[PDB]
Amino acid sequence: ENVQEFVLKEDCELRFAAGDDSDVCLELVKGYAEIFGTELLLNKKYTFPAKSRVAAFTWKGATIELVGTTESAYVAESTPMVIYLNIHAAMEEVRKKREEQAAKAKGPRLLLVGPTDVGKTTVSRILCNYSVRQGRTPIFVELDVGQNSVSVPGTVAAVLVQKTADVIDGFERNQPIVFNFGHTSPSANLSLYEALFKEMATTLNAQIQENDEAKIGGMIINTCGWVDGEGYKCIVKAASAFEVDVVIVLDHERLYSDLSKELPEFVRLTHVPKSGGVEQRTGQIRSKMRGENVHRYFYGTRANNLYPFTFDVSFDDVTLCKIGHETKLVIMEPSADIKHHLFAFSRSTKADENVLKSPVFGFCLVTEVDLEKRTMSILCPQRTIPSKVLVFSDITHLD
Ligand SMILES: Nc1ncnc2c1ncn2[C@@H]1O[C@H](COP(=O)(O)OP(=O)(O)O)[C@@H](O)[C@H]1O
Ligand SMILES: [Mg+2]
C-alpha cells in the first residue's frame, strides 16, 4: 500500500481528497491533531471512503501518515481556524457571564448564512465539538432541506451534542428532533418552509426548560444556500424565529451589506471568508449526495452498522397523505406514483392539520407497490412501525 508522510507545523492543516475509487487511512504518529474539531488518538488508525474531502489541523505540531490513493493531498499553511476558535471562545464567555448572573442561564445562539459551497456545514461541526471539549452540551440545528447532516433530505432537524463527533461518522444521532418538508428546494413551497422552521424554534425553547445543561449549551444553526429574491426574505425570518444573538455570513458581500441594514442592532453580524479548502459543487453532485444520505439513514456506517428491517405493510393499516393550496393536507390514494418515495412516520396519531407541524419518529422508503394485494414493501430502522400516519416526500431513492 502506497504511503504519504506529512509534517504539520503549528496552525497548519493537511487537506486531502480520497480518490474517485478508493479509501484512505490516516494515523497520528507523533504529537496532537484534530479533524473538524475532534481530537485524534495517538497511533489510532482512521479510515475514510472515496471522494471524501477532509482537513486534519494541529494547534501544536503533528506528524501524520496517509495510506491509500488520493485525488489531491497538500498541507495548507493559511486557514481561517483561529477565526472559528475565537467564535467558540466568545460563545463560552457569554455562558459564564450568564451563569453568574443566574446564581437558569440561557446559552448563546448562532446563525450561519451564505450561498452554496462556502464551508457552512463544516464550520457548524467545528463549533459544536469545541463546546463539548469545554465540558458543555450544545444543540445543533439543521435547516438545509437540500443537504442535511442529522436526518434525510427534505427535513429540518436538531440534536443535543454530548460527545465530540466521530471523525469518520460525525455526530451521534441519538434521539434527534425531526420535521418533514418534502422537497429539496424551499422555492417549491415557500410558505411551508417558513412554517416548519418556526415550529422547530418553538419546540426547542420548551425542551431546554427541563435540562439546565442543554439550556446553557446554546445553539449552532445551519441554513440553505438561497440568497436571491425570495431567499433573502427567508434568512431574515429565520434570524427572528430562533432569536439569534450572532449571524455569521460566509463569502457574500452584497448579502452582508443588505443584512446590516435590516437586522436588529443587537444581533452581532460577522462576515468571514470561505476556506481555500472548499471546492465548487455541481447540480449532479448535490443530487448524488442526497442519495447517499438516504442510504446512511437506514444502513448506518462502516464503524457502527445499522441492521434495517424489510417488511410488508397493508394499506388498511396506514394512512398516506401529502402537504400541498400551498399548505393544506391532501389524502393520497395509493398509486404507482408513490413508488421510490420516502414517507415520514408522524408523531401525530391522526391525519390532521396537526400533521403539518408534528415532528416525526423517523422514515421509511417505499420499495414496492402491489395495487392488487393492497400492500407495499418498506425499508424501516425498527421491527414494527412506530406510527400509522405516513407523510409524503417528493424525494425519491432507488435502493
Ligand atoms: N478546510 C477544508 N479542507 C478541505 N476540505 C474541506 C474544508 N472545509 C470543508 N471541506 C469540504 O468541502 C466540502 C464542502 O463543505 P460544506 O461545509 O459541506 O459546504 P456548504 O455547507 O457551504 O455547502 C465538504 O466535503 C467538506 O468536507
Ligand atoms: Mg452545507
Same domain, 323 and 180: no
- Nearest-Å Rg of the Cα atoms of the chain is 22
Closest to 357 (Cα-Cα) out of 367, 370, 346, 372: 346
| Residue 53 Cβ contacting ligand 1 at under 6 Å | yes
**Which CATH number do you get for residue 380?**
2.40.30.330
User: What CA dihedral angle connects 393, 397, 398 and 399, to 10 degrees?
Assistant: -110
Distance between CA atoms of residues 375 and 263, nearest Å:
52
With beta carbons less than 8 A apart as the criterion, state whether 117 and 53 touch: no
Helices 120-133 and 81-100: crossing angle in degrees, nearest 10, is 50
Question: Of 79, 112, 129, at which residue does a domain stop?
Answer: 79
Same domain, 184 and 297: yes
Q: What is the DSSP string of 124-181?
A: HHHHHHHHHHTT--PEEEE--SSS-SSS-TTEEEEEE--SPPBTTTBS---S-EEEE-
229 by Cβ neighbours in 10 Å (0-12 / 13-18 / 19+) ranks as: exposed
With beta carbons less than 8 A apart as the criterion, state whether 262 and 240 touch: no
Distance between CA atoms of residues 312 and 378, nearest Å:
6
Distance between CA atoms of residues 20 and 69, nearest Å:
9
Contacts 24+ apart (CB under 8 A), 301-305: 301/168, 301/169, 302/47, 302/49, 302/168, 303/166, 303/168, 303/169, 304/169
**Which CATH number do you get for residue 17?**
2.60.120.1030
Quote the ligand 2 centre to 184 CA distance (angstroms).
Answer: 13
Question: Cβ contacts of residue 147 below 8 Å, gap of 6+?
Answer: 121, 153, 286, 289, 290, 293
Same domain, 24 and 95: no
Residue of minimum CA distance from atom 3 in ligand 1? 277
Same domain, 120 and 255: yes
Q: How far is CA 288 from CA 40, 146, 397, in A?
A: 30, 11, 10
The answer to whether 122 is a known ligand-binding residue is yes
Same domain, 213 and 270: yes
For residue 266, which amino acid is it?
Answer: F
Question: Of 33, 49, 79, at which residue does a domain stop?
Answer: 79
| Residue 215 Cβ contacting ligand 1 at under 6 Å | no
Q: What is the DSSP string of 101-135?
A: TT------EEEEE-SSSSSHHHHHHHHHHHHHHTT
Resolution of the determined structure in angstroms stands at 2.0
Question: Of 44, 79, 114, at which residue does a domain stop?
Answer: 79
Residue of minimum CA distance from atom 4 in ligand 1? 277
Tally of structural domains, the chain:
3
Same domain, 94 and 185: yes
| Residue 121 Cβ contacting ligand 1 at under 6 Å | yes
With beta carbons less than 8 A apart as the criterion, state whether 138 and 107 touch: yes
Same domain, 24 and 166: no
Residue appearing with cell numbers 408522524:
346
Same domain, 5 and 42: yes
Q: What technique solved it?
A: X-ray
Same domain, 64 and 96: no
Residue appearing with cell numbers 394512512:
319
Q: How far is CA 109 from CA 87, 196, 346, in A?
A: 11, 19, 28
For residue 75, which amino acid is it?
Answer: V
What length is written for the chain? Answer: 399
- Provide the phi-psi class of 132: left if phi over 0, else alpha when psi is between -120 and 50, else beta: alpha
Same domain, 57 and 110: no
Residues of the domain holding 382: 308-399
Same domain, 9 and 51: yes
